[PDB]
């Protein structure tokens, strides 16, 4: 009779486990019943602190009320600019909350671009280090000598040659957040608004995001136009070094400069990048064709021969169109034997570029 | 009526858009038939 008792015991165990599952279900149901009695709370912004117990809070899409804190809250946490949860009836601040927008085009984070990706900028890389690493790594040496850090470092040169690549490389070397300016939330000189744009420039960067800045329209402001230049000078002239608005500009042309910026502190460093060297272009080919599946022998010097007067972005779409014509002719591989003809056809009025075609 | 939810074709639910007021999940009154209320058309809703 032992086997029958064991069978009924096993069925009993199954039924007990089902009962435990029912226990979990009933506790969840009671928890949701308890949740039903809860009532939502309006989301508001604290404009100003009136007294130790009075606050001014404006609803996200409503009017502003003078209210009071609930009780067991840190009034230190309730500062002008914090998101809080007003009770919907007494309007009392029950709790605070962590905080698109214009900054939706402000960030332009560097990414994981490192030194290895950038090829043929050894002297340029050393210049960036000697200019920037001291303000980052050793700001105290400037106090040791007793001078404000240099702010304006101009890495002027042709666009598409890796200026932002160099900046991202050094940023990843120091793992510092590179906040390249995308105008919105950082526009200053833009004459549409005078001081609100100044406020966005300052507060969005440096204060919130630690340091490491850049600028867009790389040659626009470097080159009503006179008044625009005076306002630019007022924007950039000289700011507190506690907060870094380091203006690492990389204007595309030398003639797009004026003596009004050549003063140190305004634009001190003049890092110069010229047309990419043939060996530098070679290294750029190597790194950019790394990712492409290149089976067989590739003699990159032959494709170097006809790569004169190019930039890095040219070389990148050379690799991309290598892949494109590999798809078009069904080759998982890509060899130099057609690298030759591709480089034969990547030089015309609009630099020919995509017409290079034959490349696998 | 923005959409037909059709949970089980027995309690179908109906997402409606009150011009600019809001959007809601309501059911028809017993007066009208579900086949008479197609998706996308405009209908009158009680205020309560």
């Amino acid at each position: 009779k032992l086997l029958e008792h064991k069978e009924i015991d096993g069925r009993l165990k199954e039924l007990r486990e089902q009962l435990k599952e029912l226990t979990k279900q009933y506790e969840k149901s009671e928890n949701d019943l308890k949740a039903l009695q809860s009532v939502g709370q309006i989301v508001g912004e604290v404009l100003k602190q009136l007294t130790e117990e009075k606050f001014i809070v404006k609803a996200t899409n409503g009017p502003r009320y003078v209210v009071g804190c609930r009780r067991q809250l840190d009034k230190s946490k309730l500062k002008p600019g914090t998101r809080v949860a007003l009770d919907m009836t007494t309007l009392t601040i029950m709790r605070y909350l962590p905080r698109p927008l214009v900054y939706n085009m402000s960030h332009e984070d560097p990414g994981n671009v490192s030194y290895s990706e950038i090829g043929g900028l050894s002297e340029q890389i050393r210049e960036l280090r000697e200019v920037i690493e001291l303000p980052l790594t050793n700001p105290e040496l400037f106090q040791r000598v007793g001078i404000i850090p240099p702010k304006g470092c101009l890495l002027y040169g042709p666009p598409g040659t890796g200026k932002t690549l160099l900046a991202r490389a050094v940023a990843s070397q120091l793992d510092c957040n590179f906040l390249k300016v995308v105008s919105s939330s950082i526009v200053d000189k833009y004459i549409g608004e005078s001081a609100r744009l100044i406020r966005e420039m300052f507060n969005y960067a440096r204060d919130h995001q630690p340091c490491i800045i850049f600028m867009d329209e790389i040659d626009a402001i470097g080159g009503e136009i006179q008044r625009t230049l005076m306002e630019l000078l007022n924007q950039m002239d000289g700011f507190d070094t506690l907060h870094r608005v380091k203006m690492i500009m990389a204007t595309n042309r030398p003639d797009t400069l004026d003596p009004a910026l050549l003063r140190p502190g305004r634009l001190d460093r003049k890092i110069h990048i010229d047309l990419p060297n043939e060996q530098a272009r070679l290294d750029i080919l190597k790194i950019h064709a790394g990712p492409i599946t290149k089976h067989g022998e590739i003699d990159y010097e032959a494709i170097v021969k006809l790569s004169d007067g190019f930039n890095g972005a040219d070389l990148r779409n050379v690799c991309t169109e290598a892949g494109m014509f590999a798809i078009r002719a069904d080759h998982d591989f890509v060899v130099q034997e057609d690298f030759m003809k591709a480089v034969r056809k990547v030089a015309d009025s609009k630099k020919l570029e995509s017409k290079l075609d034959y490349k696998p | 009526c923005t959409k037909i939810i059709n949970a089980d074709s027995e309690d179908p639910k109906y997402i409606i858009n009150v011009k600019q007021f809001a959007k809601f999940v309501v059911d028809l009154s017993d007066q009208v038939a579900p086949t008479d209320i197609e998706e996308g058309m405009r209908v009158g809703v009680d205020r309560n």
Binding site: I8, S29, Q41, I42, I327, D332 | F24, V25
Partner: protein
């Protein structure tokens, strides 16, 4: 005989009473549901299990508890029907498309062959290789280790044939073409565009 009758009656009674509690609590939940549901978008979910709700009335509230749905089965941008008064999430809702968005889809499938376009073979080839090759070939791009472009901008003087090539691409593809225009993505009501 002791164990069988004893524990059988035990677990049977406990299961029956607890199932009665299940039924009563569930019935109270459903009678609490009622109608209507004010639809809202969960802007975010914070821990302390709590959610921030943006109602269709253009009002943003906080919710210490999220209600009768599961926090795990939720994410920012979800559409949820909440209570009109307590603003507590009553139900989760499937994704909903506006009537204009639904009509945005191409169903007539126009008839414009690539041969109808004259003097534009470079542009046609580029559009096919950048919009159709990444579509119906896919893995060949991954095997070669290159990234096809995400979007294509066709610009030029009016009458060059941009809209014609778009119509031809719609005609000569099995894809789900979604025509639209810039002006119609503009509405007076805030956030509708």
């Amino acid at each position: 005989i002791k164990i069988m009758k004893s524990e059988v009656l035990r677990v049977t009674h406990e299961l029956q009473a607890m199932k009665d509690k299940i039924k009563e609590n569930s019935e109270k939940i459903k009678v609490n549901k009622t109608l209507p549901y004010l639809v809202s978008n969960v802007i975010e979910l914070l821990d302390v299990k709590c959610a921030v709700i943006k109602t269709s009335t253009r009002q943003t509230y906080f919710l210490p508890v999220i209600g009768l749905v599961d926090a795990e089965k939720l994410k920012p941008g979800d559409l949820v029907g909440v209570n009109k008064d307590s603003y507590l999430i009553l139900e989760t809702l499937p994704t909903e498309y506006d009537s204009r968005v639904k009509a945005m889809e191409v169903d007539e499938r126009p008839t414009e062959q690539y041969s109808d376009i004259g003097g534009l073979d470079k542009q046609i080839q580029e559009l096919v290789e950048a919009i159709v090759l990444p579509m119906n070939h896919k893995e060949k791009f991954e095997n070669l280790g290159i990234q096809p472009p995400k979007g294509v901008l066709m610009y030029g003087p009016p009458g060059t044939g941009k809209t014609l090539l778009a119509r031809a691409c719609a005609a000569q593809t099995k894809a789900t073409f979604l025509k639209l225009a810039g002006p119609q993505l503009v509405q007076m009501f805030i956030g509708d565009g």
